[PDB]
Chains A and B, each alone.
Chain A
Amino acid sequence: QSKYIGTGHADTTKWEWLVNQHRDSYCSYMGHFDLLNYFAIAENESKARVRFNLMEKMLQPCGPPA
């Protein structure tokens, strides 16, 4: 559950590394303030809009083989 989730190990695939990269890089986007009030100025969207977009992108971002 929470043993080591967030990073693979000796034979971790590049895709499975970038997936964790994006999945833990958005949490610093939905939680942090400067990197959330800065993306809503570029995309020109509200906080709720950008946050819901980032949350929905956590399904399988980076290009999923689903």
Chain B
Amino acid sequence: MFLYNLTLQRATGISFAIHGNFSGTKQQEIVVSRGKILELLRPDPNTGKVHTLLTVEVFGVIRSLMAFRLTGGTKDYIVVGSDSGRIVILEYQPSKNMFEKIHQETFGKSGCRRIVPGQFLAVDPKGRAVMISAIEKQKLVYILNRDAAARLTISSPLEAHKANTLVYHVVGVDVGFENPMFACLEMDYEEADNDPTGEAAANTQQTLTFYELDLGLNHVVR
């Protein structure tokens, strides 16, 4: 028996969303990662209802979404992760109602493991060099720059992976035109799992760790 699949109705779960001027103009746009499918919605004020423009079956797992419009940019480049380390920075193109992978970079293997990045995506709105990190001591720093034609040139990954330190959440704070500070709720699970007694559960709580990925140092330093 040979079976063939058909999606008689796409998913209806808004597991993620990100707001931004994605079409380029001042028109707001909200992207919803509904799991396998990614959709874009425009909140039409003339009618009140939100119109979902595109429902692209992504064939992956969008662990996180974090849009970013560059310094002096009309549209915004959505950063997406999947089951594999293939990080996709794509920008919407209203020419024919279709997306476009502006840059598909390879980070790690497939499978959302603890050491394979692709879980959390922390953008720096007051700067560049977005962090793309996993749950267990895996975090790369993609430096974004503008070419002569304002191209979104992705730099080399400046890995600042910790040692047996779990990551709760990661967000990039807007610095005052200085090196972008990136805070994360990190917890050292290595120093606790190496004692016979049992008191390691206490006295070891989460901690805010902020790294500065200055271009001068060319690496994310705490």
Task: Give chain A's interface residues, CB within 8 Å of chain B.
Answer: 1-2, 5-6, 19, 23-24, 27-28, 30-33, 37, 47, 55, 58-60, 64-66
CB distance from A22 to the nearest CB of B (A): 11
Chain A CB count within 10 A is highest, among B115, B189, B199, B204, for B115
Bin the interface of chain B by size: 20 to 34
Task: Give chain B's interface residues, CB within 8 Å of chain A.
Answer: 13, 15, 35, 61, 63, 111-115, 119, 134-138, 161, 163-164, 166, 168, 187, 189, 192-193, 195-201, 204
CB distance from B58 to the nearest CB of A (A): 12
Whether the Cβ atoms of A33 and B35 lie closer than 8 Å is: yes
Name the prevailing secondary structure of the B interface residues. Answer: loop
The listed residue (A6, A27, A55, A65) touching B196 by CB distance below 8 A is A65
Name the prevailing secondary structure of the A interface residues. Answer: loop
Q: How far apart sit A64 and B192, CA to CA, in the bound complex (Å)?
A: 9
Residues of B within 8 A of A59 (CB): 166, 187, 189, 192, 201, 204
Q: A58's closest neighbor in chain B, by CB?
A: B166
Whether the Cβ atoms of A5 and B201 lie closer than 8 Å is: no
CB distance from A43 to the nearest CB of B (A): 18
Residues of B within 8 A of A24 (CB): 113-114
Whether the Cβ atoms of A58 and B61 lie closer than 8 Å is: no
Whether the Cβ atoms of B189 and A1 lie closer than 8 Å is: no
